[PDB]
Design a protein around this nucleic acid. Sequence first.
DNA 1: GGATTACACCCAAGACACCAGGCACGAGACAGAAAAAAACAACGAAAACGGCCACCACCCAAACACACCAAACACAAGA
Length: 48
Amino acid sequence: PPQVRPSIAMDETTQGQDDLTHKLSDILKANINVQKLEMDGSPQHIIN
DNA sequence: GGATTACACCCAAGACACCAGGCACGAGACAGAAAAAAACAACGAAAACGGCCACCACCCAAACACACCAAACACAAGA
């Protein structure tokens, strides 16, 4: 939940996500990129 | 090859990504691969020349005998 990775406020209008949130976003991007290889051309040096 | 190295408290100071090559789409060229034909192997049909049996005659093989030579028990010699 967001409690484990809360955001914060820089100057009254700004927020950066916690490290875990950006890490989870990167994991999601990696997952979707994986689901973009077994659906089309993939010369075995991109799947790995 | 990692992993740990006093405890509490105070203050100040700076940053809170910018910018550059990859995915998609965006089009050519030999290579990844597919289609064809002509000189590659064989077989059917004709021609005549090489192969088989005669005919054939002169040259090599066997018998007879010659003289000649190699050879083998033993009467004699010998230590």
